DNA sequence: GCGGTTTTTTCGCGGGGGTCTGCGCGTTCGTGCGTTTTTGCGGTGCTTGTGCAAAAGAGCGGCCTCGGCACCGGG
C-alpha cells in the first residue's frame, strides 16, 4: 500500500511461476501450464484513504 | 676459506580437464512478532512514636546595751 498524493495506490500481487511462493512443488496454487499466462499484479487508486 | 661433486631449483612450452561462472528455481535459516515466567523499583495506609497593687500584722535575724560576775596583781 502506498498513499501517493490524494490517491492510495495499493498493488495487489498474485502467485506467478519463477521463485514465487515458499510453498513446495508438491502443492501448486495454480495448475501446471507452460502456455498459461498470469495476472502478476493489479494497482488501484482511491480518494478515500 | 677454497676447491670439488652433482642434486634439484629455476626456465620455458604444450596439452588436459577440473574448477570457476553465468543462470535459474527452490528452501532453510536469518530476522522480526509475539509471548512466558519471573525480578525489581515504584508507591501507599497505617503503626508506633517524638521535640517543641497597695495596706497591714506577724514573725524573724542580727545586734547592742547592759548586769554581773570572776579574776590578776599585790601583801
Amino acid at each position: 500500500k502506498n498513499e501517493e498524493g490524494d490517491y492510495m495506490y495499493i498493488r495487489l500481487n498474485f502467485n506467478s511461476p519463477g521463485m514465487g511462493s515458499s510453498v513446495k512443488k508438491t502443492e501448486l496454487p495454480y495448475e501446471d501450464g507452460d502456455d498459461k499466462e498470469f495476472v502478476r499484479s493489479l494497482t488501484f487508486r482511491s480518494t478515500n484513504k
Side-chain angles (χ1 to χ4, degrees), chain A residues 29-49:
Chain A
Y30 52 79
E31 191 180 0
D32 305 5
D34 298 357
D35 290 334
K36 289 167 180 163
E37 299 170 356
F38 288 69
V39 176
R40 190 171 186 150
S41 69
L42 299 172
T43 307
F44 292 87
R45 72 178 192 164
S46 161
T47 53
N48 190 319
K49 303 185 178 179

Side-chain angles (χ1 to χ4, degrees), chain A residues 10-22:
Chain A
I10 300 196
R11 184 179 297 172
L12 299 175
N13 309 348
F14 304 102
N15 297 313
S16 61
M19 204 183 64
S21 297
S22 61

Side-chain angles (χ1 to χ4, degrees), chain A residues 1-33:
Chain A
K1 50 168 181 179
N2 299 298
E3 298 192 354
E4 306 170 359
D6 293 351
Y7 290 101
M8 188 168 184
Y9 294 79
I10 300 196
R11 184 179 297 172
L12 299 175
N13 309 348
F14 304 102
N15 297 313
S16 61
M19 204 183 64
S21 297
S22 61
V23 195
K24 294 185 177 180
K25 325 176 193 182
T26 304
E27 296 192 16
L28 277 196
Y30 52 79
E31 191 180 0
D32 305 5

